[PDB]
Tab-separated table of C-alpha atoms and ligand atoms in Angstrom:
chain	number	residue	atom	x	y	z
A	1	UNK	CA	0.849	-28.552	-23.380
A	2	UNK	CA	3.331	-28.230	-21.020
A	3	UNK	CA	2.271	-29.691	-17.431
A	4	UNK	CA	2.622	-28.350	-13.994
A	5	UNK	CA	4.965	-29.630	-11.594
A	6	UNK	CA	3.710	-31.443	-8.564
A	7	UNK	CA	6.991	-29.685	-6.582
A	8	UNK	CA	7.759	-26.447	-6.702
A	9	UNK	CA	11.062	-25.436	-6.167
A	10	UNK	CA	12.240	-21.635	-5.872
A	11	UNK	CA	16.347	-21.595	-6.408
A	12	UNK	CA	16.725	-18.286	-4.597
A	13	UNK	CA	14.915	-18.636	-1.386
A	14	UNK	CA	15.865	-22.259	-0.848
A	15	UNK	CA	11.852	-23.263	-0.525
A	16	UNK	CA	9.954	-26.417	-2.055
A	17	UNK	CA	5.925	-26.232	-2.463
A	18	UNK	CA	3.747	-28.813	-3.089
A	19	UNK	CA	0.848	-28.714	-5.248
A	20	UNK	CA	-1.892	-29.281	-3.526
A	21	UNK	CA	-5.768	-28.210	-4.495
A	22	UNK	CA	-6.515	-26.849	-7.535
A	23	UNK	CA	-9.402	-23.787	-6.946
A	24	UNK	CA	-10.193	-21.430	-10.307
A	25	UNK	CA	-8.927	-19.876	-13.402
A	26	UNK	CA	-8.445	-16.946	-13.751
A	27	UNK	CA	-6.817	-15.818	-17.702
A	28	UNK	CA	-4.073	-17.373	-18.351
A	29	UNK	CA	-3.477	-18.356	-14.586
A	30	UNK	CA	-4.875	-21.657	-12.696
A	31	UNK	CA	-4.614	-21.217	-9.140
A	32	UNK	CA	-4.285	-23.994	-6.312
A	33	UNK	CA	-3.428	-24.025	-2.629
A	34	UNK	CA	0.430	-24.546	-2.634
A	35	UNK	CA	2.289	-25.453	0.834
A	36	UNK	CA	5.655	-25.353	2.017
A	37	UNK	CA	7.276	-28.967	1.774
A	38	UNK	CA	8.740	-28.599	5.592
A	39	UNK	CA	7.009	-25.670	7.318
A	40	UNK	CA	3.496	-27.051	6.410
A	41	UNK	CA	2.249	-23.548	5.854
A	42	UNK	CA	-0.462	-23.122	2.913
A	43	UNK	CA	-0.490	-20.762	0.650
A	44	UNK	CA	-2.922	-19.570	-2.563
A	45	UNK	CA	-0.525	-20.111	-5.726
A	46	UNK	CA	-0.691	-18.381	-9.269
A	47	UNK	CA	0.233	-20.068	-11.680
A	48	UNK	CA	0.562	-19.161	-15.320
A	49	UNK	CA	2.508	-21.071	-18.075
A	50	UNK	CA	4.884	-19.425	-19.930
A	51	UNK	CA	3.653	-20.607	-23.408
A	52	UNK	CA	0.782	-17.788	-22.962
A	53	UNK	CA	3.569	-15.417	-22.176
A	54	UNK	CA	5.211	-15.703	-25.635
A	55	UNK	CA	4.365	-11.810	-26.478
A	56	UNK	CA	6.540	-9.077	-24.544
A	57	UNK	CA	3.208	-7.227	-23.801
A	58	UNK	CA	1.758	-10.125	-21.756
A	59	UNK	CA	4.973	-10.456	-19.751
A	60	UNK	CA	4.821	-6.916	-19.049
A	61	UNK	CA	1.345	-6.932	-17.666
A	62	UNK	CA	2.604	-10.206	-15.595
A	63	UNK	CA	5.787	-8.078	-14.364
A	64	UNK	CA	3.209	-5.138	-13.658
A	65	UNK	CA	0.614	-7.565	-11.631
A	66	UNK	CA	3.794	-8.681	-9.688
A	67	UNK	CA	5.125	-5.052	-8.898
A	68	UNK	CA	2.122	-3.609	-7.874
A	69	UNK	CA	1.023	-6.681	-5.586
A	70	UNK	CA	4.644	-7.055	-3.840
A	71	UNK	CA	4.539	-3.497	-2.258
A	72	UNK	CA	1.135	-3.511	-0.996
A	73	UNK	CA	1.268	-4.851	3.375
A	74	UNK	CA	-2.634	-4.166	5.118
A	75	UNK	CA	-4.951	-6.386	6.793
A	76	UNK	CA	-7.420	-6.097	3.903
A	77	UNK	CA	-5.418	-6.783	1.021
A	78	UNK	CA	-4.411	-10.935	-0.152
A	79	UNK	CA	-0.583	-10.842	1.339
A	80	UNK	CA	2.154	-11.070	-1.018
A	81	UNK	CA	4.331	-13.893	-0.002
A	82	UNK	CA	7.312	-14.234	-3.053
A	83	UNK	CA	7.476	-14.784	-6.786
A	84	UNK	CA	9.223	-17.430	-8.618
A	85	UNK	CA	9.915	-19.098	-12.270
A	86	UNK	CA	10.784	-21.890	-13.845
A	87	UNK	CA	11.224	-22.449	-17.861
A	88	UNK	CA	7.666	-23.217	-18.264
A	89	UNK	CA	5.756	-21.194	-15.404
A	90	UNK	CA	5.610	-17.953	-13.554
A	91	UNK	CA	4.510	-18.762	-9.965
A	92	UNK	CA	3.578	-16.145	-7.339
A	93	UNK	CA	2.621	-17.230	-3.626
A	94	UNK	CA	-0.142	-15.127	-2.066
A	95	UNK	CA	-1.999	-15.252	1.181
A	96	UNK	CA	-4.844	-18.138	1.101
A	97	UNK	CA	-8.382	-16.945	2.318
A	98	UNK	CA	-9.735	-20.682	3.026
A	99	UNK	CA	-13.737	-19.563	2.798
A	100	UNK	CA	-13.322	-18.080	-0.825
A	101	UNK	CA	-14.835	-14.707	-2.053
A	102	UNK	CA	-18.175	-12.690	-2.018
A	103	UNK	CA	-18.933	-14.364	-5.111
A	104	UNK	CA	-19.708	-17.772	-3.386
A	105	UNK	CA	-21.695	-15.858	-0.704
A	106	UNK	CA	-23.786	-13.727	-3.390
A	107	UNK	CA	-24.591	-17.290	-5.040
A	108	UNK	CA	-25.565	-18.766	-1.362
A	109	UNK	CA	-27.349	-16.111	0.070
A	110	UNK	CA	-28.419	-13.346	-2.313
A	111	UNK	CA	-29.201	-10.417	-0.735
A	112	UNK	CA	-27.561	-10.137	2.803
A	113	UNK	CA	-28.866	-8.295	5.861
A	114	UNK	CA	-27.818	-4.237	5.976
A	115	UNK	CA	-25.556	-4.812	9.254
A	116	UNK	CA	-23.454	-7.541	6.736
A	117	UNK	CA	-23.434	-5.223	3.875
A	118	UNK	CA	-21.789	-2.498	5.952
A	119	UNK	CA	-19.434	-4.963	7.963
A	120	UNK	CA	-18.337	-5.978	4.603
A	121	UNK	CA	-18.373	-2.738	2.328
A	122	UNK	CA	-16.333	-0.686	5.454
A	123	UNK	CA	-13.681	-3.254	4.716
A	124	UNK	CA	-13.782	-3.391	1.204
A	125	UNK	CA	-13.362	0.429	2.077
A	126	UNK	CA	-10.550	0.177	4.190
A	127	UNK	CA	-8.471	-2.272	1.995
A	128	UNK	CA	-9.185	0.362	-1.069
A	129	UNK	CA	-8.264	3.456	0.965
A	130	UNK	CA	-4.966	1.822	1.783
A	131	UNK	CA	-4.482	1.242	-2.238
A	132	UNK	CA	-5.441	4.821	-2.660
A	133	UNK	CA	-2.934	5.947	-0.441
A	134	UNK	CA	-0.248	4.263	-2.523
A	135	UNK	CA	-1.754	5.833	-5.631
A	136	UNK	CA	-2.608	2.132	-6.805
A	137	UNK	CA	-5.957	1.861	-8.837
A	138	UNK	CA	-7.704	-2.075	-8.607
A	139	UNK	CA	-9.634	-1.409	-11.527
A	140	UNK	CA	-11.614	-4.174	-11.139
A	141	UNK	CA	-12.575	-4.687	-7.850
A	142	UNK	CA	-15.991	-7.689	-8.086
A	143	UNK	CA	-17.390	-9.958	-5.744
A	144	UNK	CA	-14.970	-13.137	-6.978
A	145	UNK	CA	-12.038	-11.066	-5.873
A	146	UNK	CA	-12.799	-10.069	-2.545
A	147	UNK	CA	-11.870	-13.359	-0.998
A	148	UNK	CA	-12.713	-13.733	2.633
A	149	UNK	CA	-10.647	-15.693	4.882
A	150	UNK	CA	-10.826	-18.039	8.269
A	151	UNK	CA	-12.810	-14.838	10.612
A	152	UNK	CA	-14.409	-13.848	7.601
A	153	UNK	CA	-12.243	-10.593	6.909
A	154	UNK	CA	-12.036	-9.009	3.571
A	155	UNK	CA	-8.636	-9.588	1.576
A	156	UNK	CA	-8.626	-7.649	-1.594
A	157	UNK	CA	-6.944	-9.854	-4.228
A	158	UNK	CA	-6.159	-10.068	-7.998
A	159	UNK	CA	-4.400	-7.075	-8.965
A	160	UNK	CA	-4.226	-8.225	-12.502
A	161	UNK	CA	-5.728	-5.210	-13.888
A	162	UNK	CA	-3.931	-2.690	-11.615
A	163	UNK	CA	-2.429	0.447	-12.346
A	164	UNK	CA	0.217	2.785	-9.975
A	165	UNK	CA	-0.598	6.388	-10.990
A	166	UNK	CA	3.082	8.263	-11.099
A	167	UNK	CA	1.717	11.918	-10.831
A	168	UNK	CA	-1.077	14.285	-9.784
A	169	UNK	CA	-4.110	14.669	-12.103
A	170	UNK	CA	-2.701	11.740	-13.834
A	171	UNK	CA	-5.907	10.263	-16.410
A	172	UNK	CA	-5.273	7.176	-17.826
A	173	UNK	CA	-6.090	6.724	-21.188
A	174	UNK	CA	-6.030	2.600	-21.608
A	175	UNK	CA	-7.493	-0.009	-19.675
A	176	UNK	CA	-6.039	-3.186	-20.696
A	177	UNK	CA	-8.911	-6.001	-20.063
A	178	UNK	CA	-12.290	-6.508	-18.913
A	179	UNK	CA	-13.262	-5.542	-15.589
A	180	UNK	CA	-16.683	-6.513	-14.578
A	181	UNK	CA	-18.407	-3.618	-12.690
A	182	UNK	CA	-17.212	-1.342	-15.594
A	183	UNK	CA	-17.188	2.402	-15.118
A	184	UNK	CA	-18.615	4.498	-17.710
A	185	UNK	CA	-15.348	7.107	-18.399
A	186	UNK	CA	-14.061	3.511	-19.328
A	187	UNK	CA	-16.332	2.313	-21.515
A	188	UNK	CA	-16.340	5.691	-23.193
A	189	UNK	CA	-12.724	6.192	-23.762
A	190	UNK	CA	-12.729	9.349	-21.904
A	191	UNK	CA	-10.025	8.989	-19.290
A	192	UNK	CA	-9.992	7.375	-16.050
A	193	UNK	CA	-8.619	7.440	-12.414
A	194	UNK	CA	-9.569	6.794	-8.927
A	195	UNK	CA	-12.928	7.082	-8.959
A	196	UNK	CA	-13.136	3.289	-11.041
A	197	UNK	CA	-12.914	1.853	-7.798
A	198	UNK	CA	-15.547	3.859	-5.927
A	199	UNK	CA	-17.711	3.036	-9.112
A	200	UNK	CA	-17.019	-0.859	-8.334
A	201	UNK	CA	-17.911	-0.510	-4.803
A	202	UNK	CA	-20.750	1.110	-5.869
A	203	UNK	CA	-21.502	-1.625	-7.561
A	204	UNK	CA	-20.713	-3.973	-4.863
A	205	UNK	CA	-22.619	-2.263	-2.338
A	206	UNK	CA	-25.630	-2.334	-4.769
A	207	UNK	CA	-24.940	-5.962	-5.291
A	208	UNK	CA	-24.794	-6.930	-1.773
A	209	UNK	CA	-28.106	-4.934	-0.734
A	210	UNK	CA	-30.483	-5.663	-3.769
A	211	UNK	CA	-29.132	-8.802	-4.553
A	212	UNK	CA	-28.445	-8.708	-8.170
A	213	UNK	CA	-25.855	-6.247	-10.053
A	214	UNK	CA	-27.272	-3.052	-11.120
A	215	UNK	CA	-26.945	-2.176	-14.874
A	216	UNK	CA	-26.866	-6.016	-15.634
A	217	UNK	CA	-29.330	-7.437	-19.145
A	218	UNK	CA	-28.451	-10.226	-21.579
A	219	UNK	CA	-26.006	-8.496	-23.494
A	220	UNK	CA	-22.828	-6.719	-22.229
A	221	UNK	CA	-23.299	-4.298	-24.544
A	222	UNK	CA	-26.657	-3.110	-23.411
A	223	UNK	CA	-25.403	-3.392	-20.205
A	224	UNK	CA	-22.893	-1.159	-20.974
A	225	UNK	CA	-25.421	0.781	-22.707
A	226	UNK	CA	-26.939	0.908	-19.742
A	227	UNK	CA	-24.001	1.883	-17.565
A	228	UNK	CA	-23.628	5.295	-20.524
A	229	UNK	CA	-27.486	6.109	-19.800
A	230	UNK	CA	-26.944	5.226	-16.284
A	231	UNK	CA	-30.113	3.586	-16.523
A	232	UNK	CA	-30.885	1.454	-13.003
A	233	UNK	CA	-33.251	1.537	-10.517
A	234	UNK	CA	-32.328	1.008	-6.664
A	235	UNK	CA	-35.498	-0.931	-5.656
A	236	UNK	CA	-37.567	0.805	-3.348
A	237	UNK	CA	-37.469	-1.401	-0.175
A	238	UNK	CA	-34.069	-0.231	0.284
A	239	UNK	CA	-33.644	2.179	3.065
A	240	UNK	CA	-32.938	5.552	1.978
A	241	UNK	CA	-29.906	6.644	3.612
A	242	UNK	CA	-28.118	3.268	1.921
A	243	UNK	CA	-29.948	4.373	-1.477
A	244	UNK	CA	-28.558	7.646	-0.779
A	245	UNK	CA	-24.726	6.646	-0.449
A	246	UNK	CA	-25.458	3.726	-3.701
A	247	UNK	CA	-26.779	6.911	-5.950
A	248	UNK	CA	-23.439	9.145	-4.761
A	249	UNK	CA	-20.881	6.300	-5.792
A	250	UNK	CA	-23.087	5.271	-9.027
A	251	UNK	CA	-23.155	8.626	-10.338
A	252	UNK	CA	-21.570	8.845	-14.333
A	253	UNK	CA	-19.576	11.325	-13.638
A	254	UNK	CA	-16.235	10.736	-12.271
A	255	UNK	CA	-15.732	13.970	-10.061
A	256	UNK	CA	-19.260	13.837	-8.456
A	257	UNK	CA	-18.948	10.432	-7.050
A	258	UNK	CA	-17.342	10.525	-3.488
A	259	UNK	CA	-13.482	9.821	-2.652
A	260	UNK	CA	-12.384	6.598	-0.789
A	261	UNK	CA	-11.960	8.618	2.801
A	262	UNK	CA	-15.553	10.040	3.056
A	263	UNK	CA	-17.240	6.731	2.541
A	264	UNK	CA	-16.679	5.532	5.877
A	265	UNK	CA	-18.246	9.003	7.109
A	266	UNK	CA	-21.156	8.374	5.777
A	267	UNK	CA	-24.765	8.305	7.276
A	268	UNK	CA	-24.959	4.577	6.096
A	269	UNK	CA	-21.906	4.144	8.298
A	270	UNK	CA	-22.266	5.924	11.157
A	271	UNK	CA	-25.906	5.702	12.452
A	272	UNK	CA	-25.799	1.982	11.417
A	273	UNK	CA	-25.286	-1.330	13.196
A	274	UNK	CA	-21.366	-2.137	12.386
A	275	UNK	CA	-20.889	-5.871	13.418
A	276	UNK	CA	-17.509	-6.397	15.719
A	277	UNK	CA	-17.515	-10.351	13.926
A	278	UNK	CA	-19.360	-12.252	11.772
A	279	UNK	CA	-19.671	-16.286	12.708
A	280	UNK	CA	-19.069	-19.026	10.085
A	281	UNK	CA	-23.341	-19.383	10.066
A	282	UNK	CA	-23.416	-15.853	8.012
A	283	UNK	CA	-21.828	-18.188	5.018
A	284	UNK	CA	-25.151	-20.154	5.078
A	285	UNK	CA	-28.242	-18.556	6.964
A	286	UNK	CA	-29.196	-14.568	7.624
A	287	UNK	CA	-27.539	-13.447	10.761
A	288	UNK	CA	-30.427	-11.920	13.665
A	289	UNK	CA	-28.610	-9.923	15.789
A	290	UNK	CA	-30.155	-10.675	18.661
A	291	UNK	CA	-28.820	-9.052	22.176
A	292	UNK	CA	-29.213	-12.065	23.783
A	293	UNK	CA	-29.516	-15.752	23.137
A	294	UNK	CA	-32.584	-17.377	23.100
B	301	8X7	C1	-3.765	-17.096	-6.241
B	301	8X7	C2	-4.400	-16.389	-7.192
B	301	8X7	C3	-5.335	-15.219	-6.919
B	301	8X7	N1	-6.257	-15.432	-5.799
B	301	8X7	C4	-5.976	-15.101	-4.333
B	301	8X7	O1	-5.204	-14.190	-4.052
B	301	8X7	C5	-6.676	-15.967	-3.490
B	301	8X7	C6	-6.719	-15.957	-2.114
B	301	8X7	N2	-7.472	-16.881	-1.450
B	301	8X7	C7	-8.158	-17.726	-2.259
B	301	8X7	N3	-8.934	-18.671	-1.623
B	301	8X7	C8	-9.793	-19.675	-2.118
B	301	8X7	C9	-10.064	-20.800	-1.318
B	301	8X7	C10	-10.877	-21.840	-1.803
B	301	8X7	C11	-11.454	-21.756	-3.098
B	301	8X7	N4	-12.254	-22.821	-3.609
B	301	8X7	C12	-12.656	-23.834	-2.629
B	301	8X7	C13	-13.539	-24.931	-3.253
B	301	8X7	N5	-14.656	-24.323	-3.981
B	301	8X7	C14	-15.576	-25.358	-4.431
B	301	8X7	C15	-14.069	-23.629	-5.130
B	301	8X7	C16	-13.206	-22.441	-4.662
B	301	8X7	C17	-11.211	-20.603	-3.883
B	301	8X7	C18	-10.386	-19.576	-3.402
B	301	8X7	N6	-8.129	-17.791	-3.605
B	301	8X7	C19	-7.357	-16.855	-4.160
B	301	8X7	N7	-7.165	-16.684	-5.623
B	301	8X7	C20	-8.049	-17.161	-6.654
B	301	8X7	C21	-8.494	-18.495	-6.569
B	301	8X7	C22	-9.371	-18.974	-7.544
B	301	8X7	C23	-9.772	-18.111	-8.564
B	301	8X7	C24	-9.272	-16.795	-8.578
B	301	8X7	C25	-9.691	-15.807	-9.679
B	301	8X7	C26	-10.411	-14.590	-9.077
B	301	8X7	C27	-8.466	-15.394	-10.508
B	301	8X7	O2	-10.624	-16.351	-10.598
B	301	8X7	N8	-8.401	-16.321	-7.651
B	302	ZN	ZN1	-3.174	-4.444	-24.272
């Protein structure tokens, strides 16, 4: 196949990158850490080669991806820093969060502690809330996408399945891919908006607490049989009032579960501990917030 430069040059802004450390795939994209040749300055680089681009549909979901990312600004979404092409490759510069996503914490630490869950599911909140504002639907908001950077912040990222909605009451009919905390009026073909993403966090928030996804067997497709029946079981060691606020976003239908500006209202908010920070040891051993050392 074609192979990827070592130097990336962008004709219209004047810039060089260097290719520096390769970190995932992600589709059709492989994505490094990129810097700028002179200012030093690193950046998270998509990169996706043309060659899988040969059908105007996939460009069109690329152009889409690109559109939706570059007019999103907030301090819990991956910041959109420029796009640029070559013959062979579409590159797009983005904001890089140097410790990774939830995913890598989920795998390290499995369940975390209530106080983390909320610290991280208010921002999770936030960062959606602002993409609800701009009538932009994630769609498939999972732990491998929530990347977390240097103070451990939440930066919502890969807007690959994203979708701007252009007018009120507005269902869409399609979902184009596979996300991975699937909501049911998806996987049913009935119709879809907002409330995907309060599914997902949903999901996430389940994830986070219990420590394994909820609707999740050997096969996807009794999982998403699963996900139709709504068939899970929040275990019981899980304090109610968290239960409570998992069983009002996990709910199958649409218009019952909550909107993005009440979660933050909620009893599992606000008569919990909400952490200011959390230090780098969170990545590795359960925080005990103790109010005082020693
Ligand atoms: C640039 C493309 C999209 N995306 C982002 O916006 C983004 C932002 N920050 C990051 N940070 C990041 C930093 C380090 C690492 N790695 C460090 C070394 N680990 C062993 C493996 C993972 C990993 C990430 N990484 C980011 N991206 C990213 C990077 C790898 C994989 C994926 C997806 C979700 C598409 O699979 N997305
Ligand atoms: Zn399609």
């Amino acid at each position: 196949a074609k192979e990827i430069p070592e130097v990336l040059v962008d004709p219209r802004s004047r810039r060089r990158y260097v290719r520096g450390r390769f970190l995932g795939k992600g589709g059709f994209a492989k994505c490094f850490e990129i810097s700028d040749a002179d200012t030093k300055e690193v950046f998270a680089g998509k990169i996706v080669p043309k060659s899988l681009l040969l059908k105007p549909h996939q460009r069109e979901k690329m152009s889409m991806e690109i559109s939706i990312h570059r007019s999103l600004a907030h301090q819990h979404v991956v910041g959109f820093h420029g796009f640029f092409e070559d013959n062979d490759f579409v590159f797009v510069v983005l904001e890089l969060c140097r410790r990774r996503s939830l995913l890598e914490l989920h795998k390290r630490r499995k369940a975390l502690t209530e106080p983390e869950a909320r610290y991280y599911l208010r921002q999770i909140v936030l960062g959606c809330q602002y993409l609800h504002r701009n009538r932009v639907i994630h769609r498939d908001l999972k732990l491998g996408n929530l990347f977390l950077n240097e103070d451990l912040e939440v930066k919502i990222g890969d807007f690959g399945l994203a979708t701007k909605v252009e007018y009120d009451g507005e269902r869409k009919k399609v979902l184009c891919g596979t996300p991975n905390y699937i909501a049911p009026e998806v996987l049913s073909k009935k119709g879809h908006s907002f409330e995907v993403d309060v599914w997902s966090i949903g999901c996430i928030m389940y994830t986070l607490l219990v420590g394994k996804p909820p609707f999740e067997t050997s096969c996807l497709k009794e999982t998403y049989l699963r996900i139709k029946k709504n068939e899970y079981s929040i275990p019981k060691h899980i304090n109610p009032v968290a239960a409570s606020l998992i069983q009002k976003m996990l709910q199958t239908d649409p218009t019952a579960r909550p909107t993005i500006n009440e979660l933050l209202n909620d009893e599992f908010f606000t008569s919990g501990y909400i952490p200011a920070r959390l230090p780098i040891t969170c990545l590795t051993i359960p925080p005990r917030f103790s109010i005082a050392p020693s």
